[PDB]
């Protein structure tokens, strides 16, 4: 290397350790509300008293911020600077700071949060010392001028490099910069490391989470052509979707649902991956408000695919999980909706899974098959398995009404597959 | 002749003791 | 864009004998005008480096 770059690297090693007093009046004078002439003349104790003055109201809003009064907002936690500590102590400092950041990420519209984190900016240089968590916890607030102030103060990491033109700017950072920020690959590995961190800690609130799905979804919007870049984009999004569905949270569930919907509708995965998606979706479909979304997810999911075995029957674990988390009459209500969304490739696949494992509710299938105008090969492919359940399952009046409906609608289709399999008069010899 | 904790509690503020404060710094990981 | 949609809206108001008197076509216009505005502020004339 050069000497000058090898020495400007030591600026990055000691960007916060103020040695000359002008370095102090640079390093203390930037904070989240106060102008740098009044921010220059602030004693540490005076800022900590305002810190507790916002922190007590925050802890009274929810008690989880009370523990940072024990450690971070302690009255003993003023004089200690970071650079005086060992890195093993600095790691625990960063742990406290990070867990505080995703916590306060919800409460950030409050001026209590702005007055609380400004001291942490000023006591622990978290605009510089830990700026990846500062930005990742507070990324969704890109319209708010509190964040826009925060942009003029953060030493920008290479991972957040779209905003290199937006630090110390007037107008707020635009919506397209969020996509171009997220359109990088390793940025998405940071956003997994944020959201997965929020999942185990269960600090996942709705507005930021809607911003997550709107950014990830717009990423696959931007990668509609770059199918090889999309094929390295499946590992980052489907991991976030899977680890999202392990949440108790229902907004996180519909978030992972939107991820799977827009991902399958933008890029056709293999069928077995969609079966994995169905297992992870249905295996945590518990609360009510996610069911209406999650049904439409599989409605999209089975429509996103095409191949050999396009509408084949589901596995018995998958089908019994589906018929545990939904009833029959759930889908019997849903297909009679006036929205009536096109789950055409799902029904003709799921009725076969009824027709092999269960076989007990084919009056239900009659109700099902009168509801939806299906596809041409689909009805034929249902009728072949119903020929199979004519032959091997003992013939019953439910199947008689089934095939009488199938003579009422597309008798000749039945005649063609019967000329393919079996005979015509032998099907009259069925019942 | 030991100290109590309440004389230690004013010693902890008076002597500049951070070891208990570093304990609470190092205490918690994913507390919810 | 407004002066465009104003011509679509005013003539919906000044030249319709049957009329809901309810502001829909103007709101149908204003939704698209706001959408052009929201697409317009989405663009930035700066350089956005990767």
From Swiss-Prot, chain A:
<comment type="subunit">
    <text>Interacts with snoRNA U3. Interacts with MPP10. Component of the ribosomal small subunit (SSU) processome composed of at least 40 protein subunits and snoRNA U3. In the absence of snoRNA3, forms a complex with other t-UTPs. This complex can associate with pre-18S ribosomal RNAs.</text>
</comment>
<protein>
    <recommendedName>
        <fullName>U3 small nucleolar RNA-associated protein 10</fullName>
    </recommendedName>
</protein>
<feature type="modified residue" description="N-acetylserine">
    <location>
        <position position="1"/>
    </location>
</feature>
<comment type="function">
    <text>Involved in nucleolar processing of pre-18S ribosomal RNA. Required for optimal pre-ribosomal RNA transcription by RNA polymerase I together with a subset of U3 proteins required for transcription (t-UTPs). Involved in ribosome biosynthesis.</text>
</comment>
<comment type="similarity">
    <text>Belongs to the HEATR1/UTP10 family.</text>
</comment>
From Swiss-Prot, chain B:
<comment type="subunit">
    <text>Interacts with snoRNA U3. Interacts with MPP10, UTP21 and UTP25. Component of the ribosomal small subunit (SSU) processome composed of at least 40 protein subunits and snoRNA U3.</text>
</comment>
<protein>
    <recommendedName>
        <fullName>U3 small nucleolar RNA-associated protein 18</fullName>
    </recommendedName>
</protein>
<comment type="similarity">
    <text>Belongs to the WD repeat UTP18 family.</text>
</comment>
<comment type="function">
    <text>Involved in nucleolar processing of pre-18S ribosomal RNA and ribosome assembly.</text>
</comment>
